[PDB]
C-alpha cells in the first residue's frame, strides 16, 4: 500500500535523474530494479527512458526506446509523442513525423499540438520545403492553427521567395476565420514587386486601398507598389507612379513617407526625365541618416546614384550637383 | 387582457384544396428556395455552392441520377435538416394511374 508507493517514489526521483545525465543503460537498470521486484513501470517511468535517448540526438535509439512500448502494450503518454516529433522536426525527418501522427490518430489523441510543434520546429531549421508540406497537409482538413504560426510561415515563405506556398497558406488562413491584415499583404508584396510584371502587385494593392479597416495600405505597402512600377521592362510607367503619390498625399494624416519612399521616387523620377521632380525629392532624402548609400544600394538596378549625378550634369543643374 | 386572442387565431377551413395545387405547380420548391436564400448575402455564391454540392453528389454515387435530379436532391437535403419533411429529391408519384402517361392539360 503506502510502503509500496513509498518505495516507488524512491526509484522514481532517481529514475528521471538517469535522464538528467543522459544515460542509456543506467535508466534501464532502474527499470530493471522494479522489473525484478514486480513494479509495472507507469507509462511516465516508461517515457523517461525515451527522453534519455532523445536528449542524445539518437534517431533510432529513441525509436527502439519506443519500439518496446507497443510490444509491452502500455499506451504511451501525450508527452511521449510530443518529445519525439520535436527531435524529428529538428533534425529534418520528413515522413518520420507523420509516422507518429498516425499513432494518435489511433490512440484517441488529437494531433493539433503535435502538428503545431512539428511545423514550428521544421522552420527552426532550414527545412523550408518540409515546413510547407507538413502544414498544408494537416491544415487542408479541419485543423485550426495559432495566429503565431500563420505570421511565421507567411513571412518565412516570402523571405525565400515562395509566393506559391505563401499565397496558399494565406488563402487557407482566411478559410478558418482569421482575416488577413496589412502585415500579411506586406509580406506578399515583397516578392510580387520583384516579378517583372507590374500589374500583379497593383491588384494586391487595390485589394487593400478599397478594403476594410485593418487591411488598409501602410507606408511599407506603398513602397512595394512604387518599386514594382519603376523597374518594369517595357511600356510607359511614369503616370501610374503619379497616381500612387497622389493617393499617398491625400491619405496623409495616417501615412507618412520614409527613407525608401524618397529613394524610389528619386530613382523613378530620374530614369524618365522628370529631373525637376527629382531634385525636389532628393532634398527630402538629404535629411535622412542613410544618405545616398541606400539610394545607390549596390551596383545593380542600374546604379540609381549614378543616374542622379550624371543626369544633373547633362541637363544643366550644376549647383545642386 | 387584449380581446383579440382568438378572433385573429380562428382556423381558416376549406384549405384542403388550397394545399394540393401548390404541390404539383412547384410551389413548395419555390417557397423553399427563398427560405433557404433568406439568410444568404450573395445569391451567386449560394448558387455556386449548390452546383458544387450537386456535382459532388453526381460523382460519388453516379449510377442513381438521371431521374432524381441531384440538384433537387441537395435542395431537399438542405431543407430536411430543420424539419420541413420535403420527400427525397422532391420526387413526384402517380398514386392513381392505371396508365402510362397523364394528359397534362
Amino acid at each position: 500500500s503506502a510502503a509500496e508507493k513509498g518505495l516507488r517514489l524512491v526509484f522514481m526521483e532517481e529514475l528521471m535523474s538517469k535522464a538528467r545525465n543522459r544515460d542509456a543503460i543506467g535508466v534501464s537498470d532502474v527499470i530493471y530494479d522494479m522489473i525484478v521486484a514486480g513494479l509495472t513501470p507507469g507509462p511516465r517511468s516508461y517515457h523517461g527512458l525515451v527522453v534519455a535517448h532523445v536528449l542524445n540526438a539518437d534517431e533510432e535509439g529513441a525509436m527502439k526506446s519506443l519500439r518496446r512500448e507497443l510490444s509491452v502494450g502500455l499506451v504511451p503518454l501525450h508527452e511521449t509523442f510530443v518529445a519525439l516529433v520535436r527531435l524529428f522536426g529538428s533534425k529534418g525527418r520528413a515522413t518520420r513525423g507523420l509516422e507518429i501522427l498516425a499513432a494518435m490518430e489511433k490512440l484517441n489523441y488529437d494531433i493539433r499540438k503535435a502538428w503545431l510543434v512539428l511545423v514550428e520546429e521544421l522552420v527552426r531549421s532550414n527545412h523550408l520545403e518540409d515546413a510547407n508540406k507538413v502544414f498544408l497537409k494537416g491544415a487542408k482538413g479541419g485543423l485550426r492553427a495559432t495566429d503565431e504560426i500563420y505570421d511565421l510561415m507567411i513571412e518565412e515563405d516570402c523571405k525565400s521567395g515562395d509566393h506559391s506556398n505563401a499565397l496558399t497558406i494565406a488563402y487557407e488562413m482566411e478559410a478558418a476565420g482569421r482575416m488577413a491584415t496589412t502585415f500579411h499583404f506586406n509580406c506578399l508584396l515583397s516578392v510580387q514587386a520583384n516579378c517583372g510584371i507590374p500589374e500583379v502587385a497593383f491588384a494586391t494593392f487595390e485589394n487593400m486601398e478599397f478594403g476594410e479597416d485593418y487591411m488598409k495600405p501602410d507606408t511599407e505597402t506603398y513602397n512595394w507598389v512604387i518599386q514594382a512600377y519603376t523597374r518594369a521592362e517595357s511600356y510607359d510607367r511614369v503616370q501610374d507612379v503619379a497616381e500612387l503619390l497622389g493617393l499617398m498625399v491625400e491619405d496623409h494624416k495616417r501615412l507618412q513617407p520614409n527613407m525608401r519612399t524618397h529613394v524610389l521616387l528619386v530613382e523613378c523620377f530620374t530614369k524618365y526625365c522628370v529631373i525637376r521632380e527629382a531634385i525636389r525629392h532628393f532634398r527630402a532624402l538629404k535629411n535622412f541618416e542613410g544618405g545616398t548609400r541606400l539610394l545607390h544600394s549596390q551596383g545593380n538596378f542600374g546604379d540609381p546614384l549614378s543616374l542622379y549625378l550624371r543626369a544633373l550634369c547633362r541637363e544643366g543643374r550644376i549647383e545642386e550637383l | 387582457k387584449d380581446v383579440f386572442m382568438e378572433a385573429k387565431l380562428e382556423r381558416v377551413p376549406f384549405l384542403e384544396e388550397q394545399m394540393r395545387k401548390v404541390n404539383e405547380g412547384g410551389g413548395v420548391m419555390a417557397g423553399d428556395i427563398d427560405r433557404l436564400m433568406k439568410s444568404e448575402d450573395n445569391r451567386f455564391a449560394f448558387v455556386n455552392e449548390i452546383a458544387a454540392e450537386a456535382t459532388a453528389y453526381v460523382n460519388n454515387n453516379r449510377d442513381e441520377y438521371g431521374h432524381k435530379k441531384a440538384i433537387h436532391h441537395v435542395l431537399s437535403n438542405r431543407m430536411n435538416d430543420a424539419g420541413f419533411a420535403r420527400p427525397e429529391a422532391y420526387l413526384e408519384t402517380e398514386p392513381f394511374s392505371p396508365g402510362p402517361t397523364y394528359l397534362k392539360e
Partner: peptide, 9 residues
C-alpha cells in the same frame, strides 16, 4: 456566378 468561383476548403 463567374465573379469569384467556389473553393470548398
Amino acid at each position: 456566378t463567374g465573379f469569384k468561383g467556389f473553393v470548398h476548403h
